[PDB]
Design a binder for this molecule. Structure first.
Ligand SMILES: Cc1cc2nc3c(=O)[nH]c(=O)nc-3n(C[C@H](O)[C@H](O)[C@H](O)COP(=O)(O)OP(=O)(O)OC[C@H]3O[C@@H](n4cnc5c(N)ncnc54)[C@H](O)[C@@H]3O)c2cc1C
Ligand SMILES: Cc1cc2nc3c(=O)[nH]c(=O)nc-3n(C[C@H](O)[C@H](O)[C@H](O)COP(=O)(O)OP(=O)(O)OC[C@H]3O[C@@H](n4cnc5c(N)ncnc54)[C@H](O)[C@@H]3O)c2cc1C
Ligand SMILES: NCCCCCCCCN
Ligand SMILES: NCCCCCCCCN
Lengths: 499, 497
C-alpha cells in the first residue's frame, strides 16, 4: 500500500519525506507520535508573544553546515533575515570575585588553551591509552604543570574550563575526556526561527502524508519481502521501505524486555547484535533550557555570552601544592551538601544584544537539568533558585537586583530596575518521546559504533536516521537533516531504477 | 703529523655545544669544538646596552613548553635551586590601527573571533588533503574573504586581513613571500621568556673539557680520506684528522658550498662534494629574516595592561568595495592593482613591553622581511632609525595613556635613551635568521638529506636538520644530542670481545 513509511516527523524524517517528493515518489506516510511536527525542534511563545527555540537554537559549523548554506542561499535571494551570528567575547563571573575574563593577571583563557593542547597530546597516537573523565584529565594537568601556575590560576581555571559541560550536556565527572574537545568548524549562527526551517520543509511535501498521533508499537518485516508497521490504535500498514528516525534513547528501549514503556517499538526479528552492542558504548546527555523574560532591557549589552563559574576554594590550591601524586591528590580531594545555582557552571545568552528581546536564554546540564525540569510548574521555587546568580549578572552588567513580577503589580519605582515577568523551562528529560537531549559519551565509550551500525541499517528496507546515526554533525540538527536526505536519496535511486 | 681526534664539531652554537656535552657524558675523549667567532652561542647572543641592561638579540623564548626538552631541564634546575631562569609572558594582544586606534576585543569588529574562523578555514583548505596547490599566505586570506563575504561586515573585511599578519613575525617573512601551507602550525603550550639565554649557553659549555674549545678557528675545508679518516683544515693552517665530524653551520652558510669561489667567510670546501640529494634540497627550502630593535627609555611612564602589542599596516575602504564587487578569484586578483614608499605603517610590527614582564623600561620589537634587511642596513644611523619609527612609537604611547616620545639619545614624558639593532642579515656567519618556507617549498627534503648525512663520518646538526622544533633553539639542541648519540653508539663497539 505504501512506498516509504517514515517514522517520526522531526527534521530527519521531514527532510527524508521532502526529498522523496522532490524525486517524484508517491504514496508515502509520515507517522508521528506527538500532535505536532518538529521533534526536538520546537518554538514556543511566552510573554507579549515572544518566541524561543526551547530546543535547538544554533546553526553550528557554518563553514561546512549544508542546512545553514541552504538557509544562506534563500536569504541571499530575498533579503529576508533567517539568522544572526551571535558569537562574542565571553564574560565569566565568579560569585565572590566578579568578572574574571580577559584579566591582566589571571589570563585564564590563555592557560585554558594550553589545557586543551595538553588533552590532545594525552590521547594522541596511543589508542587512547585508557580514557578517563574530563574531571580526571583536568586534575592531571594541574598536578603536572603546577610549577607554572599561580595560586588563582590553579583555583579559577578548573571552574572556567567547565563551560564545555554546556556543549555536551554532562557534568565534568560524568563526561568522557577523550570526546570532550571537538572541532569548532567555524562561527555559530543563531536561527531566527528553527520553526521556519521546520514549516518550509514540512510544506514541501503532500500534506495528506502526515499522520499525527500514530505512536508505532511494533515493526515487522515478513520474509515475504515487505514491511508491516502497526500504530498504537490498531491501523496497520505495509510498505516497500521504512525509515526509523526515533531518538537513540527511545530505540534503546527495544533491547529491554517487558517492553511496555511509552514510545518503545517491537522489532521482529529483533535488532542484530551489532546494533544491541552499540548501546553498551553509552550515549545520551541532558542539556536543558530555562528562559527569563523581562519587561525591557536595562543592563549592559557588552556581550551576548555569559557564564557563571561554580564556587571554588583556596584550600584547593594548597591541596594541589602539596599532593605528591595522582593517588594522594585523589584521596586528599575528599571533603564532606545541597545543590544551588553556584554548584555548577551556567551559560546565559543575553538575547538583548543579539535579537533585541529582553530575555536571557540559559543552558544547564545533568544532573541539574533533570532536577530543574521536575519543578518546571513551580515558578516561585524556580525564582528562588536562580535569583542569586540572576542578581550577580545584573551587577556585573551595571544594573541592580532583579524584581519578581511574575505575579505583576504595576509600580513606577521599577524605573530602571530589571523586572522578571515569566519563566519557561524545557522538559526533554521527562518527555517519553525524547528522554534527554542528544547523543553523548561517558568515559569508555566509542560513538563510531552506533554511527556505523545505524548507517548500515537493520537490512535492506529498514534504515535509520537522526543525529545519532551520522559522523559529520553528530548530535546536531544539520547532522540529522543530512541523515534524512541520506536514506531518501538511497531509496529514491532504487525506486527510479526498479523500472 | 696532524693531530688525531675522535670527533670534531664545527661551530659552537647550541647544537654543537650540546653535541659535545653529550659526547663527554658518554665518556668519549679527545674531541674538539671549532668556532669561527670569538664567542660561543651563535644565534643565542646576549648584548648589553643603556645602564648595563641586558637583551637577547637572537633567540628570546622557549617555545612549546609542554614538550620542549631543553625547557624541561632549565625547569628542573630552578625547581631544585630556586633561581629564576625564565618567565611566562604570554598575554592579551593589543592591536592598533593608525586612524582607528585600538581595535582589539572591540565589541563590534570581533576581529579575534573571525581570525579563528580564518585559521580553521585554512586548516580545512590543507590539513589532510592530497594534491592541493600551495599559493602564498596573502592569497589564502584573499580567498577566505571571497568565500565568506556574505558573513563579514564591511569593517571586518577591511581590518581582519591586517590582523592576520601577526604571523609574519613567527616566520620572519612578509605575507606575499610566505608559504600558506606552512603558515599555520601547532603551539604545544605557552611560551616562556628566557631571562638570560646566554645563561643556558654557558651551563652547556662548561659541561665538557674546556681544552676542547677552540674559538676563532674558521674551518675552510673538510675532506674524506677514503680509509675512515676525515681531514679538517682551519684557516690559521692547523690540520686535524678525526674519525667523525658534526657540521653545524647555518643552512645559509652551508649553501655556499654548492657554489664555486671559496674565498667567502664561512664557506667549507667539501671533497668529495656534497651529494646531489643535498645540493638539490636547497631549491626546496629558504631562509627568513626575523629581526629585532630595542628601544631603551629612562623610566616607565606608560600603561602595563599587557606585554604584547601589535601595530597593523594601513588599510583602505577601496579594498572593501573591491571585495564586494569582485566577480570571482581572477577578477579580484585583477582589480587589486593600483598606482608609494615604505614607512612604519607599511607592515605589521610586534612590540614586547618589557616593563610589565621584566620590569625594565624598554620595548623589544620584532620585524620581518623585507623590512629587516633594509632596517639592518642602516642600523648605524640612530637618528634615521628614530625618525622612521617615531609615528608608531607615538601612537603606542597615546594608546597606553602617555605622550609623544622625546629623543634623548644625545619629567612626565617618555625619553628614548638608546636604540639597539640586530645584525643577522649582515654577519657572514648567520646570513639571515633561520630556515623558512616559500610557497611551493618542501622542508621535509632538507631534513631528510641533512639527518641522513654526507656519508657515515660526515654528519649535520642545527635548526634546519630536524622536524620537531624546526627553526627553534630546542630543535637545534636535540639535533645535536642526536648526532652525538649515534657516534657514541658506534664507538661503543670497540669494547666488545
Ligand atoms: C535543549 C536542546 C538544545 C539543542 N540545541 C542545538 C543547537 O543549538 N544546534 C544543533 O545543531 N542541535 C541542537 N540540539 C540537537 C538537535 O535538536 C537534534 O540533533 C535533532 O533535532 C534530532 O533530530 P531527529 O530528527 O533525529 O529527532 P526529533 O526529536 O529530533 O525526534 C525523532 C521523532 O521521533 C518521534 N517518535 C519517537 N518515538 C516514536 C514512536 N514510537 N512512534 C512514532 N514517532 C515516534 C518523535 O516524537 C520525534 O518527532 C539541541 C537539543 C536539545 C534537546
Ligand atoms: C632574530 C632571531 C630571533 C630568534 N628567536 C627565537 C626564539 O624566540 N625561540 C627559539 O626557539 N628560537 C629563536 N631563534 C632561532 C634560534 O636562535 C636558532 O634555531 C638556533 O640558534 C640555531 O642553532 P645552531 O646551533 O644550529 O646554529 P648557531 O648560529 O645558531 O650557528 C652554528 C655556529 O656555526 C658557526 N660557524 C659558521 N660557519 C663556520 C665556519 N666556517 N667555521 C667554524 N664555525 C662556523 C657560527 O659562528 C655559529 O656559532 C631566533 C633566531 C633569530 C635570528
Ligand atoms: N556555550 C553554548 C554551547 C551550546 C552547545 C550546543 C550543542 C548542540 C549539540 N547538538
Ligand atoms: N606576536 C608575535 C610573537 C612572535 C614570536 C615569534 C618567535 C619566533 C621564534 N623563531
Amino acid at each position: 500500500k505504501k512506498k516509504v513509511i517514515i517514522i517520526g516527523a522531526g527534521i530527519a524524517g521531514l527532510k527524508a519525506a521532502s526529498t522523496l517528493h522532490q524525486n517524484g515518489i508517491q504514496d508515502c506516510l509520515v507517522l508521528e507520535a506527538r500532535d505536532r511536527v518538529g521533534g526536538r525542534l520546537q518554538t514556543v511563545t511566552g510573554y507579549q508573544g515572544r518566541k524561543y527555540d526551547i530546543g535547538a537554537s544554533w546553526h553550528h559549523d557554518t563553514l561546512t553546515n549544508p542546512l545553514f548554506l541552504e538557509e544562506a542561499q534563500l536569504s541571499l535571494n530575498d533579503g529576508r533575515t533567517r539568522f544572526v551570528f551571535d558569537d562574542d567575547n565571553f564574560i565569566y563571573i565568579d560569585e565572590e570575585r566578579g568578572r574574571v575574563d580577559h584579566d591582566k593577571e589571571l589570563l585564564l583563557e590563555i592557560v585554558d588553551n594550553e589545557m586543551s593542547k595538553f588533552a590532545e597530546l594525552e590521547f594522541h597516537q596511543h589508542l587512547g591509552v585508557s580514557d578517563c573523565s574530563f574531571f580526571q584529565l583536568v586534575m592531571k594537568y594541574l598536578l603536572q604543570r603546577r610549577q607554572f601556575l599561580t595560586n588563582d590560576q590553579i583555583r579559577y581555571l578548573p571552574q572556567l574550563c567547565r563551560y564545555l559541560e554546556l556543549w555536551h550536556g554532562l557534568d565534568w565527572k560524568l563526561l568522557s575526556a577523550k570526546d570532550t574537545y571537538f572541532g569548532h568548524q567555524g562561527r555559530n549562527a543563531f536561527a531566527l526561527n528553527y520553526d521556519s526551517v521546520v514549516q518550509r520543509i514540512a510544506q514541501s511535501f503532500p500534506q495528506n502524508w502526515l499522520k499525527l498521533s500514530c505512536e508505532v508499537k511494533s515493526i515487522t518485516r515478513e520474509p515475504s519481502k515487505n514491511v508491516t508497521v502497526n500504530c498504537e490504535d490498531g491501523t496497520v500498514y505495509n510498505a516497500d521501505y521504512v525509515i526509523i528516525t526515533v531518538p537513540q534513547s527511545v530505540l534503546n528501549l527495544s533491547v529491554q524486555p517487558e517492553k511496555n514503556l511509552r514510545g518503545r517499538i517491537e522489532f521482529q526479528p529483533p535488532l542484530k547484535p551489532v546494533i544491541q552492542d552499540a548501546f553498551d558504548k553509552i550515549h545520551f546527555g541532558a542539556l536543558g533550557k530555562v528562559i527569563f523574560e523581562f519587561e525591557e532591557c536595562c543592563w549592559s549589552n557588552e556581550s551576548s555570552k555569559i557564564v557563571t563559574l561554580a564556587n571554588s576554594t583556596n584550600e584547593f590550591v594548597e591541596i594541589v601544592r602539596n599532593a605528591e601524586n595522582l593517588d594522594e591528590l585523589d584521596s586528599m580531594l575528599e571533603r564532606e551538601t545541597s545543590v544551588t545555582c553556584w554548584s555548577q557552571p551556567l551559560f546565559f545568552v543575553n538575547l538583548s544584544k543579539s535579537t533585541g528581546v529582553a530575555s536571557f536564554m540559559m543552558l544547564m546540564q545533568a544532573p541539574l537539568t533533570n532536577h530543574i525540569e521536575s519543578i518546571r510548574e513551580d515558578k516561585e521555587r524556580l525564582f528562588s533558585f536562580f535569583q542569586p546568580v540572576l542578581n550577580k549578572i545584573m551587577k556585573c552588567l551595571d544594573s541592580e537586583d532583579v524584581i519578581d513580577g511574575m505575579r505583576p503589580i504595576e509600580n513606577i519605582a521599577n524605573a530602571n530596575k530589571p523586572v522578571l515577568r515569566n519563566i519557561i523551562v524545557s522538559n526533554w528529560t521527562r518527555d517519553p518521546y525524547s528522554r534527554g537531549a542528544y547523543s553523548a559519551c561517558f568515559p569508555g565509550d566509542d560513538p563510531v559504533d552506533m554511527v556505523v551500525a545505524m548507517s548500515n541499517g537493520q537490512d535492506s528496507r529498514i534504515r535509520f536516521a537522526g543525529e545519532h546515526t551520522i559522523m559529520d554533525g553528530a548530535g546536531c540538527a544539520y547532522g540529522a537533516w543530512e541523515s534524512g536526505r541520506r536514506e531518501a536519496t538511497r531509496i529514491s535511486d532504487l525506486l527510479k531504477l526498479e523500472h
